[PDB]
Structure 1
């Protein structure tokens, strides 16, 4: 049907159809009389997956023969979403499969909906890892993602009585066709035990062993015939484990619990032993695998020439002392040489400056679980502090600030300090964030080793986040400028010369309307909710956090409702306000915020005077597959974190690419987005970082805003008095108390500017032609935010390798 989806050749369609039938029969053991819709999905998945294998084998063969430098991306999170459509897109099979299934009397889109998301991440950090894998394959890098194969990913969110309920994401229940178990590479991981010192070095003895069994998932590049590997480890008890008899077998569960479940905390540290075990498990198994591959090329001097390890935050920080442990204790290298190798091998990416998110592990935990690593960390700290003392003689406070060991009630290890000390490169994820790292939390480190500190602004893959989710937009762009932009997103600049093109303006607006109609229809079918598709789609989707300020959005919504109630017969631009995202199960305030949103909806959506002029909808179970649907449908992207709190954001980039305008603070990558698009084409409001700093010096007094803004006082009075909870008058007292007395994120301080800015959004939307022209100016300048750009910068500036867009032979 549409060009960017590829060719539907006669031979190809015929072959797909027969391979589909072969799989239905031989693989699924069904015929068309008894086959379930799930059977059809699996038949199709198997048919598509067959097309990966030749390329996958030859890619890995090629790496073995050419021996390039290998890149190892270590993450506890890979937020992959669904795989079927992505594989079809990257192999140019989409149109052919659509045709093949159509001829078999099946709707491919319906089949696609059957696939579970691989929800192995919480949000931004995990999705970033996934976009990165796509870009690394597309750029022909010899890259491997390494992580954990969680049996349960991020929980499925159900809303019951306006409250978040969690249920287990049993994503492997029907079997995962996109993985291959690799039992021959099963490896032992050690825990507990004790350290003996012999005549010939330290030895780690009396350990408990858990096996790490790898599962490989293919990562196809975009039409370049490259298929890289994501290798995820699963925990397995050894067979003699605990070996009355029955109990010993049942107790195997204890060891295998390591890979059971993803910790559902977004930007928050929880010092639990099981989490520490997960972090070591991935690191120990991965490093053995890396070393094995390196030896199958004795001389560890060449190790950094053949290996780069990228640490996705501090979660895999134990890679540093683990590498030292293997090099010193097992390979018998001297400390200084091992350390040189380690530093040149490792690089560290920081993802937040929020203090509660930073990993600070109690010493007593590491002492019991990882005694040799603790000793190695102490030694690293001593040698590091000796360097600081020599550089800054007599500066005793600097020594305590820079220490890897934090003193206090319980001694803790600061993992971020460990990462900086043991990495040749430290990067933030947007320009303002990287500057904040140098100026504030890592200032001491920057002064010691300025050359270590870099910026690498985040990006998103235009395959998933344009071609896959928004084929209509991809097509109208390709019609004017060709297909090359899909792997060279900077080419979107060419669209600037179409900003006054009446045909293009109409097509851009038409694609948006179609997307909105489709999404409005999705909402009725799967959720029985009614929305006006001619309204402005105002969306904020992202994890629920105080710093992300869904509450400020709530305040605006109530403002609009109150204004309508006061002047019912005045025209207002109709809006559908959509808010979605999961709250960490233990985060009370975030759970209260969800209840508030639904409570507002309950009042607003049933007020006869309001009509279809204002609707508030909570988008349940926000996840990658839902983002692919809602983002193409959005008109207005809410990116409203307090300045200095959102390191980068990536949801912001997704909306920009898909034709929504942005209302946002100058925070994270919003700054660079406004810079690329021009500030005239962005709805910027609120305090800058400098303004927040000024307010902190004076002391933030929320009462002042309450006293001076009548519209704000009304809202607080409504919340307090039970207007939004008639049968539980004090339900939202915690929210009011927080806003009035202990608001770290200064919700009231940005309220007036936000409401004014929102008025300017409504004004522009009234002029569809000018709305669309500004949209074109956003899409046209979204090129910088391709993860291909980001990865090219990591490659050249950190890993020391050159990207290549050249095809491997098919």
Structure 2
């Protein structure tokens, strides 16, 4: 059908058809008279996965022979989404399978909708890990993703009476065709116990043992025949566990609860024991696996030449004292050599600046659970602080500021401080975030070791986030500039010479229109909701957090509503305002914001005077599969965090690549995005970081804004008095009180500029030719935000390895 989806050869199509029927019969034990759509999906899935195995076996064989330096990417989250289409795309099988299934009398797109998301992450950090794995395979690096196989991923979100309900994401219910259990490689992980000191050093004894069972999932590169591995650990009780009889067997559950569920509280650090166990479990199992592989290459001096470990935030920070423990206690290296090896091996990526998100584990927890690790941490702290003392003699306050141990009511370990001390590199995830690290939160560490601090601006994979989710746009671009850009996204610059091309303009706008019709249909079909596809699609999708300022968007929405009611017979650009995202189950304010959004929808969507000039829809259960649908259909991307709070953002980049214009603050990656496209091609508004700092100095007084902006006052009055909650008039009192008296994120301060800027957006949209021309200049300059570029920078500047675009033999 379309070019970039590969060849549908006669030989291939005939082969796919017969293997499909083979799987239906032998694998699924069905025949065509009993088979459901789900059976058909599984048959296709097995037919496709057959094509990975030879490539997977010989890639891993290749790494054994050539013995390159290995990259280990440690994360507690991998937000993978669906795998079928991604695999077809990366193997050039998409048109062939489409044809084969067509001739079998099936619609492949319908089968694709049956696959569950692998929802093993919360948001940006988890999705970043998934994009990175894809780029690492595409760039031919010998890379492994290591994490936990959660039985339950991020909860499915139901909206009930306007309110979020959570339900278990039982994603493994029907089986996972993309994993291979490897029970033969099961490893023991130890907990509790005590430390004994002997003549021959320390020994960790009387431990409880939990088994770590690995499951491998393939990660195919883009048409280079490379298939890397993601290894996820599952928790298993040992067989003499608790071993009246019946109870002992039932208590095996306690051990296995370690990998049962993903923590969804991305807002607020909770020092929960189960979470600590999860963090140690992935680290202990992974490091044994690493050392095993290394020993199959006594000389640990070569360890850093052969191993790189990337720590995705502080969640796997225990890798540092765990590597030390192994090297010192088990291999009997001396401390200094062990430390040298550890530092050269580990690197740390920070993904936030919000204080309440930082991991600070109570000492009494580490004492009971990991007694030997606390001792190692204490020793690291002493030696580190001795280095600080010698560099800044007499600076006693620096010492307490830099300590890994925080004193107070409860003593705590600062895991970020541990990571910086024990890593040769520390990076932020966009240029302004990295500068903020060096200037404010890790200033003392930067002064001590400026060489450690780097930037690696985030990216997204153009395979999933263009080719897969927006084939129409991929095709019209391919027609003009060829297919090479898919794995060299900088080529999109060549599109600049088409900004005045009437045909291209028409094609870009047509692709968008089709995307909007497709999504407007999806809404009616799966959610019985009626939207006008000629309106501007105004979309904000991301986790619900105060810093992300979904509330500022709410304020604009009500402003538009009030202006319509005021001058009903005046013309305004019609909008469909879509907001979506999950709230952490314990985050009251975020749950209230969701309720507000639905409450507004309830008023706005049923007002006859509004007609269909304004619609407000809450997008339920936002997740990778839904992002792949809504992003290609968007016209306006809302990226409106208070400057200084969004470390990078990556959703922003997905919208840019897919032909939406951006309204945003100079925050995170938005800055670099505006820089690449030109500030004239971006709707920038609001305080910069410096203005925020100024405001904090004087003190932020929300009342000032309320007193001087009558349009804002009106909104606040409506909220208080119960205009949006007729039956519970004080329903939103918490929200109003927060905005008026304790708003950490200065919602009111940006209100005027935001509304003004929104007027400029509406103006441009009235001129379709000029809207589309600006869109073209965005797409054309989105090349920098490919994760191939990000990963090539990690490889060269942190891990010390050269990427390669060369094919392995098929």
TM range (shorter): over 0.9
Instruction: Give 3-state SS (helix, strand or coil) of 1:440's partner.
Output: helix
1:502-529 deviation digits (Å, cap 9, x = unpaired): 0000000000000000000000000000
SS at match of 2:286: helix
Deviation at 1:43, TM superposition (A): 0.1
The corresponding residue for 1:213 is: 213
In the TM superposition, residue 277 of structure 1 has moved relative to its aligned partner by 0.2
* Contact in 2 for aligned 1:656/1:782 (Cα 8 Å): yes
SS in 2 for 1:579: strand
Cα shift at 1:120:
0.1
Q: Distance in 2 between matches of 1:631 and 1:191?
A: 44
- Which whole-Å CA distance do the structure 1 matches of 2:687 and 2:302 have between them? 49
1:298 Cα offset (Å):
1.1
Distance 1:183 1:268 in 2: 35
Shift of 1:64: 0.3
**CA deviation after TM superposition for structure 1 residue 267, in Å:** 4.2
Q: 1:358-395 CA deviation, whole Å, 9 max, x = no partner? A: 00000000000000000000000000000000000000
- Checking the alignment, whether the CA contact within 8 Å between 2:284 and 2:322 is kept in structure 1 is yes
C-alpha deviations, 1:768-788, integer Å up to 9, x for none? 000000000000000000000
Matched, 1:501 2:529: no
Equivalent residues in 2 for 1:653-668, closer than 5 Å: 653-668=653-668
Query: Residue 441 of structure 2: SS of its match in structure 1?
Result: coil
Matched-pair contact (CA < 8 Å) for 1:152–1:171: yes
For 1:611 and 1:329, locate their aligned partners in 2 and report how far apart those are by CA, in whole Å.
73
Q: List per-residue Cα deviations over 1:151-175 (Å, max 9, x = no partner).
A: 0000000000000000000000000
Deviations 1:187-211 (A, max 9, x none): 0000000000000000000000000
Distance in 2 (CA, whole Å) between partners of 1:19 and 1:441 is 57
C-alpha separation in 2, matches of 1:589 and 1:419: 31
Asked if the contact 2:267–2:587 (Cα under 8 Å) also holds between the matched residues in 1, the reply is no
- 1:57-113 CA-to-partner distances (Å, cap 9, x unmatched) read 000000000000000000000000000000000000000000000000000000000
Q: Quick check: 1:516–1:633 contact (8 Å CA) kept in 2?
A: yes
Question: In the aligned structure 1, how far is the partner of 2:745 from the partner of 2:302?
Answer: 48
Residue deviations 1:322-372 (CA, integer Å, cap 9, x gap): 000000000000000000000000000000000000000000000000000
How far does residue 268 in structure 1 lie from its aligned partner after superposition?
2.7
2:43 is paired with a residue of what secondary structure?
helix
Considering only aligned residues, what root-mean-square deviation do their CA atoms show, in Å?
0.3
Q: What SS is found at the alignment partner of 1:119?
A: strand
Deviations 1:640-661 (A, max 9, x none): 0000000000000000000000
CA distance in 1, matches of 2:171, 2:81: 11
1:545 match: secondary structure: coil
SS at match of 1:751: helix
Give the drift of 1:266: 1.9
Alignment check: 8 A CA contact 1:301 1:341 kept? yes
The answer as to whether partners of 1:17 and 1:104 remain within 8 angstroms in 2 is: yes
Indicate whether 1:432 and 2:432 are aligned.
yes
Partner Cα distance (2:781, 2:84) in 1: 30
Question: What secondary structure is seen at the aligned counterpart in 2 of 1:472?
Answer: helix
Separation of aligned partners in 2, 1:452 and 1:772? 43
**Contact 1:59-1:228 within 8 A present in 2 as well:** yes
Deviation track 1:300-333 (CA, whole Å, cap 9, x = no partner) reads 0000000000000000000000000000000000
CA distance in 2, matches of 1:778, 1:432: 21
Query: Separation in 1 of the partners of 2:259 and 2:524?
Result: 38
Worse-matched range after superposition: 530-539 or 268-277 = 268-277
Tell me the equivalent position of 1:570. Answer: 570
Alpha-carbon distance in 2 for matches of 1:101, 1:225: 24
- Encode CA deviations 1:116-147: one digit per residue, 9 max, x unaligned: 00000000000000000000000000000000
Structure 1 unpaired stretches of 5+: none
Contact 2:573 2:762 survives alignment (8 Å) = yes
Aligned 8 A contact 1:366 1:373 in 2: yes
SS of corresponding position for 2:388 = helix
Q: How much has 1:571 moved relative to structure 2?
A: 0.2
Provide the rounded CA distance (Å) in 1 between the counterparts of 2:266 and 2:539.
20
Q: Gapped runs of 5+ residues in structure 2?
A: none
Distance across 2 between alignment mates of 1:755 and 1:518: 30
CA contact (8 A) 1:574 1:612 kept: yes
Deviates more, 1:585-594 or 1:265-274: 265-274
1:260 alignment partner in structure 2: 260
Q: Judge conservation of contact 1:544–1:581 (CA < 8 Å) in 2.
A: yes
Per-residue CA deviation, residues 577-605 of structure 1 (Å, 9 max, x unaligned), is 00000000000000000000000000000
CA deviations 1:249-278 (Å, max 9, x no partner) are 000000000000000022431110000000
Q: Is the 8 A contact 1:267 1:352 kept in 2?
A: no
Residue deviations 1:454-486 (CA, integer Å, cap 9, x gap): 000000000000000000000000000000000
CA contact (8 A) 1:424 1:452 kept: yes
Q: What is the rounded CA distance, in whole Å, between the counterparts of 2:703 and 2:90 in structure 1?
A: 55
Determine if contact 2:267/2:584 at 8 Å carries over to the other structure. Answer: no
C-alpha offsets along residues 519-578 of structure 1, whole Å, 9 cap, x if unaligned?
000000000000000000000000000000000000000000000000000000000000
Structure 1 segment 232-247 matched on structure 2, within 5 A: 232-247=232-247
Per-residue displacement from partner, 1:411-435 (whole Å, max 9, x unpaired)? 0000000000000000000000000
2:228 is paired with a residue whose SS is strand
**1:492, distance to aligned residue in structure 2 (A):** 0.2
Provide the C-alpha distance between the structure 1 equivalents of 2:245 and 2:783, rounded to a whole number of angstroms: 62
- C-alpha separation in 2, matches of 1:675 and 1:271: 40
Alpha-carbon distance between aligned partners in 2 of 1:455 and 1:625, rounded to the nearest angstrom: 30
> Deviations along 1:5-48, whole A, 9 cap, x unmatched?
00000000000000000000000000100001100000000000
For residues 639 and 271 of structure 1, what CA distance do their matches in structure 2 show? 31
> Which stretches of structure 1, 4 residues or more, deviate above 6 A after TM superposition?
none
Q: Is residue 738 from structure 1 mapped to residue 738 from structure 2 by the alignment? A: yes
Following superposition, the deviation at residue 214 of structure 1 comes to 0.1
- In structure 1, the residue matched to 2:303 is 303
Superposed CA offset, 1:203-244 (max 9, x none): 000000000000000000000000000000000000000011
Aligned counterparts of 1:626 and 1:111: Cα–Cα separation in 2: 16
CA distance in structure 2 between the aligned counterparts of 1:634 and 1:143, rounded to whole angstroms: 34
Within 2, Cα distance between the matches of 1:586 and 1:240? Answer: 38
| 3-state SS, counterpart of residue 235 of structure 2 | strand
TM-score, length basis structure 1: 1.00
How many Å separate the matches in 2 of 1:182 and 1:64?
19
Q: 2-side partners of 1:161 and 1:292: how far apart? A: 54
Question: Corresponding residue for 1:533?
Answer: 533
Tell me if the contact between 1:638 and 1:664 (Cα under 8 Å) persists in the aligned partners. Answer: yes
| Mapped partners of 2:203, 2:128: distance in 1 | 38
CA distance in 2, matches of 1:268, 1:556: 28
Across the two proteins, how many residue pairs are aligned to each other? 810
Specify the SS of the correspondent of 2:666.
coil
- SS of the residue 1:426 aligns to: strand
Q: How much does 1:766 deviate?
A: 0.2
**Match of residue 175 from structure 1:** 175
Write the distance in 2 (CA, Å) between the matches of 1:799 and 1:505: 42
